Every structure is written in C-alpha cells, then in structure tokens.
DNA sequence: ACTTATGACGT
DNA sequence: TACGTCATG
C-alpha cells in the first residue's frame, strides 16, 4: 500500500530572505525580497518574504515592478564577485542546516533550500523506547493532519489545526488507526524536533511534509506554510488527489503533465485511477506509465538517497540581448571569471569533502537559440587552476565560432565540474 | 532581458 | 557523448 517507508521533505521558507534577515535585523518581519543584478529594472527577484507575497510579489519578477506592487518592499542584493552573482553565503547557510538535519536521520539534499529525509529507521527506534506511551498533542505543536477535522474554535486556523490533530490522535490511541499511521505520527514528532533544532541553532524557520514517499512528502510540505508541517497519510490520498491539479505533482509540472492532461482529457490527479497500467504505458511509455499508475494511488518508490553533497559544481552567467559576447577577448575574459570562482569552490570542496573533480564540462548558448544550452563539450579536469581550466574550456569550444570577432555571439557561458573521486 | 545551479533520462 | 532534453529551486 506504499506505507512501508516514512519520508519527509523539509523546505526553508524563502531561504535567501531568511539568510539576509538573520544578518540584518532591520529586514525581519517586513516585506522583503532578495535581488540580483540591480542595474536592469532593479534586478530580478529570487526570493520573496511572506509579508511581500501578500502584495503579489513573486520570484522571477523585476524589482522595479515589485516596488509598484509593494511600495514599502525592502531589497537585499546578492553579493557580486568577478562580475557575477555570488551565492557563497547561501551555500554556507545551507550546509549549517544539513548538518543539523544529519543528526536526526538520513538526508538527501534536493536543492540549496530543501532536503528529503528518510525517517523509517529513526521511527522504529523511537517506537521501542516509547512503547505503550500515548502521544500527546504537545509533541506536535505545528503539525496539520491533511483531511482533518471531518464531521467557533474552527473559524480560526489554529482552531482547525487542533481539532484535526485531536481527532487523529484520539483515533490512534483508540486503535482505529493503522500501523503505518502511527509510523507517520512518530515521524512527525521527530520532524518537529528536527525543525526545533534547526531554528534554535540557526535561527531559520522551515516547513515540512511527512508521508510515505517523496512525491507525497513534497506535496504535503506545500499545504501549510510558512513554519508549519503537514502529515499526509495513505488514507488522505483519495480526497486530496480528487481535486488536485496534475501539474502540482512532482515531475508533472512540465511537458509530461501537460501531455497527460492533453492526451487523457483530465485535469486532476485522482482521475488517473480509471486507466489500466497498460493504457498509461502505451501513451507515455513503460516507466512513466508504471509510475503514473502507482502515483495516482499515492504509491511511489524513489528512495531517499544518502547524499548531502552535490554531484557537480558549477557556475554560469547569462549575456542577454545586446550584452551578448561578440569578441574573442570577451569570451576568454568571462571564461576566466567563471573558472576563477570554480577554482575557489573546488578547493573548498577538496579540503572539506575529501574528493576531487575529474571532468570539466563547458556549456554555451548562442544568440537565436531558445534552448537552455545550445552546446555542451567536456574535457579532462587535471588541475584546479583557473587559468588552465579557462584555457582548456576555450580550446574545446572555440571551434563553435562560425566567424578577432565571435559569432554568433554567446548569450551564455557555463563551466561545470563533474565526476568526483575519493581522495 | 526573468538568472543561476542541480539532478536525471534517453540514445 | 551530448550529448541533448526535461524538470525544478
């Protein structure tokens, strides 16, 4: 029934904003955003506080337009180094959180602000120590139970939260709830503690989803935000999916989800239940069909990968429109700038994480191409040397220039290090 | 003129 | 390999 595992998805609420708010107290509890590259239209927003979201301010919005929506908005700019955005501060804060999470359970870093947590073993241990012990509501002070309450206090959201938690707990206590339900509940108690440790030790608040797999846990995470956690049980899946737009499910937010909607003639996740697996496999392929068939039933098997460390390290800069690189010197100079930041990051990785990158991947985008990458070429990464890496990167891609000039001018340079080896 | 990074799959 | 494409933060 896909109830074997307990899995959490933890997400740092507007993480870059929190990092800035911790460092500059004046920014706390105010409509706030983090921007990069202020010159063009105030710069683009990459993180927005909840106070600012109320005004309709979103990420990937220009700061000048954001100010139109929210006149009182406070802006924090990303550190700029070597002519590009420098995210070191956020990566460092990110590592702080992952270390704390690591003490409680097995974690998979999903991005800079999120991680999956496999709590199956952790739950098993707690159960033995806590045998025969009722689970107080006091253990779950920020937990919402999806689908509850069912059946004056309720007008307030905290009123709703309490009643749902009480019905849920009373039903476990009674013996009405299944064994996987108890596992999730203990998982949630563990996550409350993990979240309390994170805030105490970093000052950072975060939301979490708790469920039996990654898709459900990620879904649950978004249900009650910010600074709250949501338990989605197997039993809640039918009602939850019944009105749940397909594009909301992890991995269905793009072309596949669109074609599932377009080919099937449906809009909600639960509608997928009417199709046989073979029907779904014939439309979308063996793997996707199988995965769809199981997912609409709340079943998903992707494991939480024990991996706190990124598999690749990289940096990129965009040169949109008129700023597109059109000279040899410009291309070399920017490759150098990128290779310089890469070196610093690689060396830090080497001393901290006891591994070295062995392959250098160069990606570029040319003017007139919509695709994220127009071209990708690799070469050996023998020495963590910015001048060598930059020069090697040039060698592999120089043949791309059709015709001291460069054309078609590049709208993108990307350097990425891959294939890490223990040492 | 939404920028900057990652992880994973198909071939 | 792109080595290239998809999906997401």
Curated annotation (Swiss-Prot):
Known outcome of mutating residue 50 to E: Reduces DNA polymerase activity. Increases fidelity of replication and reduces translesion bypass
Resulting phenotype, residue 50 to A/F: Reduces DNA polymerase activity
Effect of residue 185 to P: In XPV; likely pathogenic; loss of DNA-directed DNA polymerase activity; loss of function in translesion synthesis
This protein's GO CC annotations: cytosol; nucleoplasm; nucleus; replication fork; site of double-strand break
Name of the protein in question: DNA polymerase eta
Keywords, ordered alphabetically: Disease variant, DNA damage, DNA repair, DNA replication, DNA synthesis, DNA-binding, DNA-directed DNA polymerase, Isopeptide bond, Magnesium, Metal-binding, Mutator protein, Nucleotidyltransferase, Nucleus, Schiff base, Transferase, Ubl conjugation, Xeroderma pigmentosum, Zinc, Zinc-finger
Post-translational modification: Monoubiquitinated by RCHY1/PIRH2. Ubiquitination depends on integrity of the UBZ3-type zinc finger domain and is enhanced by TRAIP. Ubiquitination inhibits the ability of PolH to interact with PCNA and to bypass UV-induced lesions.
Shown chain mapped onto the complete sequence: 3 to 432 of 713
